[PDB]
Design a protein around this nucleic acid. Sequence first.
RNA 1: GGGAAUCCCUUCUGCAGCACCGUUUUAGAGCUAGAAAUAGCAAGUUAAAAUAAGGCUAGUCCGUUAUCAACUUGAAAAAGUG
DNA 2: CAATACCTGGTGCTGCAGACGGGGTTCC
DNA 3: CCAGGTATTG
Length: 1333
Amino acid sequence: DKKYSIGLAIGTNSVGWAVITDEYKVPSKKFKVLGNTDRHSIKKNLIGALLFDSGETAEATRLKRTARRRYTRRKNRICYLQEIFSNEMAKVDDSFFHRLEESFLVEEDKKHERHPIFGNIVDEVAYHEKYPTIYHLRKKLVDSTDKADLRLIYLALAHMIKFRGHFLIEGDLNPDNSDVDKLFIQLVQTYNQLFEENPINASGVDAKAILSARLSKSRRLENLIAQLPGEKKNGLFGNLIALSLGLTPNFKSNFDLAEDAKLQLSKDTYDDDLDNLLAQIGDQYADLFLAAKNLSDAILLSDILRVNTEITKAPLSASMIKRYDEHHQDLTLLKALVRQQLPEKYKEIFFDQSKNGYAGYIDGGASQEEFYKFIKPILEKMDGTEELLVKLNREDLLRKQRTFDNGSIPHQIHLGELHAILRRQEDFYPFLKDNREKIEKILTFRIPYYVGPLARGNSRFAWMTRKSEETITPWNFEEVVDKGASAQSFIERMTNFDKNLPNEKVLPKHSLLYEYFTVYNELTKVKYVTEGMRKPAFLSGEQKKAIVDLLFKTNRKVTVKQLKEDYFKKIECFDSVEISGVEDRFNASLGTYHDLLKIIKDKDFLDNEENEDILEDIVLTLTLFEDREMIEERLKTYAHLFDDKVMKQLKRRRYTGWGRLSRKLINGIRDKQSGKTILDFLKSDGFANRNFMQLIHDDSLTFKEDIQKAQVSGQGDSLHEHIANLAGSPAIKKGILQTVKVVDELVKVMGRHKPENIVIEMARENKNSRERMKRIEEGIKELGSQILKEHPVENTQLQNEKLYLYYLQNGRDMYVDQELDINRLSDYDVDAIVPQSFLKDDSIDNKVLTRSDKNRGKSDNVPSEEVVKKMKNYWRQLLNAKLITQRKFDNLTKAERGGLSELDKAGFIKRQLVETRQITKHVAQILDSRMNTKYDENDKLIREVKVITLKSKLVSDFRKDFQFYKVREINNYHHAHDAYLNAVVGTALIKKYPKLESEFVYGDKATAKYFFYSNIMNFFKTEITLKRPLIETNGETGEIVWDKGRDFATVRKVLSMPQVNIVKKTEVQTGGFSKESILPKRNSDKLIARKKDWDPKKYGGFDSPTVAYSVLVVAKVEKGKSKKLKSVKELLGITIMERSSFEKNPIDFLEAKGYKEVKKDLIIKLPKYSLFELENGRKRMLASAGELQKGNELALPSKYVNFLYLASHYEKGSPEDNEQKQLFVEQHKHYLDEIIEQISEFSKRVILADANLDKVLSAYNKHRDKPIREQAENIIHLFTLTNLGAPAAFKYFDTTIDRKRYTSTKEVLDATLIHQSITGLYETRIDLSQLGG
RNA sequence: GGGAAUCCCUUCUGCAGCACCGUUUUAGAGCUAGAAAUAGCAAGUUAAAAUAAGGCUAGUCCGUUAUCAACUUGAAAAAGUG
DNA sequence: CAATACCTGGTGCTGCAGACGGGGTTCC
DNA sequence: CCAGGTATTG
Ligand SMILES: [K+]
Ligand SMILES: [K+]
Ligand SMILES: [K+]
Ligand SMILES: [K+]
Ligand SMILES: [K+]
Ligand SMILES: [K+]
Ligand SMILES: [K+]
Ligand SMILES: [K+]
Ligand SMILES: [K+]
Ligand SMILES: [K+]
Ligand SMILES: [Mg+2]
Ligand SMILES: [Mg+2]
């Protein structure tokens, strides 16, 4: 009675729970029932499962929040411009902005004339005739010298400001890198300057048309190279052109380089990458690569601007007008062609918005892509459509001006047109001259990402600090906003403090002191032996100093070969030396030292300790800030120390990331007796050579004492705060908090008696096609492969394992250097790099596509050495293209390092059994600290409750070994059953082997451990491979842990119990008010106004609102023309938008809806999934205010569940055991009819879907000659009809059963409402029939 | 067992700053023949404004995450109840 | 009222911090 | 993908 344990199964949508006794039995209690029914108590088994909707991330909320801010600020830009235009526009047209503001209104509601620009129909029609698009007006106002109407000037400037373009490019544009011809010519000039003996004849080469052509980068490269005889695309000039076109050329073979020189102008590394390449071949080639960069800028701009820039200063608007003119010409030609050749199709093409013709393209919902797909065969079917087809395949036919690709347009182009119009019209309007830079600033200004929202103490997201308390504008931003303090707070609010010194900021990752620390920390544990030496020796202080000065300060990376040859041979005169503590090359390195040595070119400055501070500060500025102007402002204090050239090169250098220790810990605090810092000991510590860990843990030093003193205790978090700050998915965090609440309630159930053990098991948890396609595109263009050209793929298709592996392997076998056939993927094998017997990893990271798995070698180990020798280079190419990860490459190449040792296999099995994920440890810590709170005489924790953590494989193997099978589709009982089995297995496992507590309980020979952990669960078995007692006891205590004659029967009876407390968490719905779609006007009271005065009957709006929670209303409503009061009882869905109004005053809200004399005390708040019971135990859940969900569980008996598992081949064993299971299936075939009858009785009692049940019965009687396996597999599908929750469709073979929905909630108003606690053991039942007259 | 620093990374959480579309109502004089029903043709590419209703704290801020059985108290926060 | 069937905001970019899981060097 | 809103049909 008093002693019990708890089993828990923590999932993303469920928390299973069970209470067990000494004999692994589940108790049952009488629980009091509250309410107004005649039932005063109820018998409950202490087993169940809480169900809840998934916890959501904050991402969608954040995207909507930032979009909201962007809409507000766009409006503010327009408002700034209008404030500038106010007075003079009032002189010209005192209602122009008023007409713009009310343009959306219907004429009935307009307070001014309905024509926006000019206020009369003649002028308006004339305007549209002269300027059919806004880009016509923009080009005119840029080119013309005449004084223009102020309203048209405003419209042009406002159109530029409202849709200003991206900010991906820093600086200014059109810096004479505009022409592709001239930059190509200059690239030829530079190349011919370096290679006089090998010049290129570029005469007659139309570089403009070739490089700006609308074709793939590689195709344009091929076109240009074809125009150059004796020049190949992978030559030097070909690689430069490929770099300008945006490809990833490898300049290695061009310059006979050893280090691969892959360059892409888009990658962040290029600025350093080039500097690396230029380090090997010299700086004579710098001019060449920079000329190629200029050419790249030219080609990128030629993508956007398709017009000659010498006829107009508005090339973008001119290109839009080109779109318009070609659209007009081609539409005229297409209309004439269709009239002549296909006159019957003309109406469908140009009049039917429902079809994807021109009518649906302009008036319907047809996109440019859909319109091209619809009209492609029509153009092919006709004659004279040759050039129209050319334009269609170029995606340049009948184009609009506002299109999806206009995202390419940089803001500098709109800025050029804006500045041009201002320059034209400031000659006539003085306020345009005085406010020119102001309007330009309105277009150009961005709030920096490091500043955040410009709040004033009412934003939990803001961090900006102001230099003065006044309104921030785009023009006073630098003066009002403290950009320095704001940018510093942006980082320091997120960065960790030193854990050893909690009040000390952490050093920058690339700090010189930090890398000195890391290098000395690694170097102090290096040992070496020679011949005459008796014992390996540490490196002395002088030796480490010499190694740093000779190797670490002359090479970016120091290898063990460099250590042996460049020091031990050159200095110590050793011909042979054995090194330990480092393999291949040192992990740490003085990278910042070499960066700054290249930049400032003063090694003595870098080595002088007096400059330490300065250098540190500099790196800090390069790490703390990312804006080059702010970096310049901060480095200005050291301008006197370096040349202007060095200062510029220093500006361009930037670092990211932070270390993990503070400067005060590394080189600040000093040991009391020695007076030496941590770094001082790392540089020299006699013959002990203590490292960081030893230094801060040595009781003979002051470091440990000072670290203990420096720790501070912050304000303790709450349970919810602690769980929220955990590192994990918000879904599993929701599960964790629910688990803790379940444990608290269970302890209260057991009379505040704490359990003996708590066994917890956390489920392994596994758009995305977009990320996969991004990976494959990047890796293939980085690879330089044409696999996407020769074989096109949709991102969705990549959800196929084998095809995704095909593209990740560039269509090649991973074990044989051969090509694979896409059409033969069904014949190929997917192989685990490390076998799944050892590592149960089914990720693409551990899988590989090969023709035959036989070719991997031996199945017991990692791929053989022969395969590695064959395929290592191909694997390295796949690695550098990110097509395979480093771990995948290392597992693939482990055979050359000995392959899998026996220790590796032992560790793999141990991993399969012992849980090591950090989040599970955090849950165990939470439970352990809540259960165990007292301390003993030695002030050590008293662990009354053992928190055991198990992995899912233990209970899964238990179920499969002792035929306690699970079928998830039958019902939700399997969560509770998993919890029960977790408790049983964990308690029994630690009872049998107490020494396992260290492995399995929270708190403080390889063949032998492999054998042991593989045979840890054999004590449950009676006979193993190739016998054991029926009673299993503990060896030392003699206590019984498992009775194989009685306890298995207990587990069976527990899993057979029909009454299981499955509780669906009732939740108030939150989030969006309704569907986002802005529907057109319609006569319906379902439409919701998008603005207070926008009557949806005239303006359209939203519908489909989400009900936050329903409310039971008992009141009277007026009836008929007489308004006679009639008593009612009904459900009112309070929408999310209505919730605040309803809660502020419920009576006023309800009376506004029409209810009179509302019984205030009878108002019942009913969230989603509110439980109601009707007749014959039939239950419903509240799906909404006008729909219900299935509220019952189908407790299918255990015999039928195990039969369904075995018959369907759900998941083997000995062939004799296989045939025993097959013979049992065939001997119990009648279980099929018995299961169908169980389902039918359940559906007639509870589901009440006459049509669906009859159709299912007909479908079952139709496929009775089908194989037993397939019939069982589809019986599994049938349980969707009876599953708890929302109805859904399901297929029995090819017969589709659509969901029967409960579109009415009238009945629950007279049924019994059931309020359940979190476990469901405590209930309050309210007979709703006793409400209302 | 647990933990630390470094290397190669890997995956995910949280935050800020932007762009392009979409949609919605209005504006872009449709014409001719019919009494009209309708028929024959012309035309189409653009813009304004909104983009959670809105809020007070009035900021170039905030408004979709997390958390929530019932009951007794409680203004609430919370505690308590089988 | 029951069956039925439709519908459902999307794309692209920049910058930053952190923990996580897992191979390796060294330690507590 | 779900699964609740909506209108159409009856
Ligand atoms: K009017
Ligand atoms: K050629
Ligand atoms: K369209
Ligand atoms: K190494
Ligand atoms: K930085
Ligand atoms: K100077
Ligand atoms: K919520
Ligand atoms: K939700
Ligand atoms: K509940
Ligand atoms: K590690
Ligand atoms: Mg707004
Ligand atoms: Mg638009």
